[PDB]
């Protein structure tokens, strides 16, 4: 139902999502990413939610997870690609005032200086 | 006026199932996508609660939804008897949540308001937490 | 362990909501179109059956599906709270129905039958009636 | 849940028939059909189950149905297209010997005078 795909460029760990983000499915990102954030240096961190068909609030959990994992090494977190009912779920919660959505990988990694 | 309910393991590989399979009845209706999104997320959250709260993920608890429909209205139920809740003014309270430790958002309630014409959540400590959403 | 209970009205328009419910929670177990196909269509012979001799097509009537699945079994129970069979032994006779009026053909348990390992019935007259089919 | 397609060949009815056949669907074909047979002097029927996805007995029960009538004017009932799952309920109902097949449609009328 999730499938994962992850790639780290410089000091940025990029997560693309392809399927249901719930609390089932919730839980593989979450080992893999702070397992990935164990493993190496990464001060920031890009969700596409490209090709996400749906999301629930145990979604907005694990990415809030990962916002003050990001945010105890002075690093940003931006979404990018976010569906219309994803970014709803967004505005509900009030996190429009806590990570950075851009339109695609390209802008958020443009939105972190990386070469 | 048509009917439908489903219970099942306390799994969360269950938990798309569920919506799924509601999503299918609810489908007659021939409803807006946008629709169909609130009340697979709706679902989906009222039956996180269930199995990772009410029954603290034990596999054994035995989640309850139902589904009635009448008037074109819908009459979404989800129930479960576990632990239930303390404080139902607590709870609504937006952002709340017990687990915080499960990196629980606590917005799981909020969500089912946004989407939801009307909710409804009745609970009692040790008898399990029933709640009623309704869409019109 | 794992397992579901799915009660739906006596309609005719939920069978085939019935029969993918049954059949999806089944995918569980990694089966083939040939053990899906099997399986989906032992279920729409059991339950339009609960529908048409037990729930004479009164929307009204409950009908009740147990799929619990353990180890490699597919324990499924279909089930009635209807008119139940006065003659087992006689309708579990090849090609012996009791509407030749909706055109039925009694091939409602050797499909069982055949597409199942077991099928075993119990049925009181009043009483309603209640279909053991397995499968591994 | 049933896409119908009737088509009238002279005396041959041709029932194209895509989507699920079950209780529900096959009597709203067992009900366009013999719409058919009373407005018009159906002899023989091609029945098309090319784009079928499912069946259960109903669908043997519907189409043994269509024969009688079909017996009657001494005519032929003709099911192309098979699936396998399917031909495993005519091999399992014995509606075989009542019901013949053919490889596709154009052999179903080749059998019936065209
Ligand atoms: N079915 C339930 N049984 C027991 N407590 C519940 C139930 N549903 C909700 N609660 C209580 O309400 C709190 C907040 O729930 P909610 O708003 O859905 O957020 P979350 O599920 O992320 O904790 C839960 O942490 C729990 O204390
Ligand atoms: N739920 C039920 N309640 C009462 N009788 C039943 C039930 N299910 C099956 N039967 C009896 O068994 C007969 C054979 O059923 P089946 O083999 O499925 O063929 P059919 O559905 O074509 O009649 C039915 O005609 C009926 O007399």
Known sequence: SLAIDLEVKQDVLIVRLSGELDHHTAEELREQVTDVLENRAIRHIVLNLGQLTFMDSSGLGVIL??????????????VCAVSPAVKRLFDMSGLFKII??????????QALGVA | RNEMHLQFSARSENESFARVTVAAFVAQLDPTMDELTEIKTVVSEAVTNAIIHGYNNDPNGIVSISVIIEDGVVHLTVRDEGVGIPDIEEARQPLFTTKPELERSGMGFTIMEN????????????KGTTVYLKKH
């Open chain 1, 100 to 109: 950075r959505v851009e339109a695609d990988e390209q802008f958020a990694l």
């Open chain 2, 115 to 126: 989407f939801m014409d009307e909710v409804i959540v009745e609970s009692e400590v040790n």
């Open chain 1, 65 to 78: 997870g990962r916002y003050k994992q990001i945010k105890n090494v002075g690093g940003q977190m931006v």
